[PDB]
Each structure stands twice: as structure tokens, then as C-alpha cells.
């Protein structure tokens, strides 16, 4: 049985636009990137400080079928998204947080 990791997705505005700053369990800024050495879960908790009503709607992939991440779950309030990574398939995948906001009807994406 595996690792449950917890990362906090703090989002701020700078120049009127969102910036994503990731924070580990110790309160340290991290790059966001992870390594999975066995089957487990990565839990991301949204700390929206943009005043823009952000909610997670999903986690987006340019190579969604590469099998690195097996599933995505999300909470009914959009504050939490979890990835299931069963760690069968080796390799690397890049993803982006997809979020709704209350200022407008466009979706927000974290940087590629």
C-alpha cells in the first residue's frame, strides 16, 4: 500500500492574472512536480486568494492516454482534486489544472 501526498494550490493575482504557487505539507514552496515510487494518491487543495471564485473542474492532459495517471477525482465544492496513480506505467506526464471562475465564463488553466 502506498503514499498519500498533499499539495496546496495557492492562487494569487498578479498583473490581474492568476499565479499558482504550490506548497508542501511542511509549508514550503515547491515546483509542483512529483515522483511516484509506488501506487498512491496526490491530493491537491485549492487556496484561492484571487477573489475570483475559482473552483477545480478537472485536471487536463495533452497526453491523456499515456497511462501515467489512472484517474482524477474531484469534490463537490471544487476545492479538492485527487489523482490516482497506480504506478504500473513508467514515464512522465505533464498536466494542468482546469478551473471555473465567477468573473466570467472562460476556464482557467494553470501553466503548461
Amino acid at each position: 500500500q502506498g503514499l498519500a501526498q498533499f499539495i496546496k494550490v495557492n492562487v494569487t493575482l498578479e498583473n490581474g492574472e492568476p499565479v499558482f504557487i504550490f506548497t508542501d505539507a511542511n509549508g514550503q514552496v515547491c515546483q509542483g512536480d512529483i515522483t511516484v515510487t509506488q501506487a498512491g494518491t496526490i491530493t491537491y487543495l485549492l487556496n484561492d486568494q484571487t477573489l475570483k471564485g475559482l473552483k477545480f473542474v478537472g485536471v487536463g492532459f495533452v497526453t491523456p492516454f499515456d497511462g501515467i495517471i489512472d484517474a482524477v477525482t474531484i469534490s463537490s465544492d471544487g476545492m479538492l482534486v485527487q489523482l490516482v496513480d497506480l504506478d504500473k506505467t513508467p514515464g512522465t506526464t505533464k498536466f494542468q489544472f482546469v478551473l471555473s471562475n465567477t468573473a466570467n465564463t472562460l476556464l482557467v488553466l494553470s501553466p503548461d
Binding site: 504550490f22 501515467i68 495517471i69 506505467t89 513508467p90 514515464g91 512522465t92
Partner: peptide, 7 residues
């Protein structure tokens, strides 16, 4: 961000 798998 990036995720790296190593079984």
C-alpha cells in the same frame, strides 16, 4: 506540473 512514474 509534471508527474514521473517509477514502479
Amino acid at each position: 506540473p509534471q508527474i514521473i512514474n517509477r514502479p
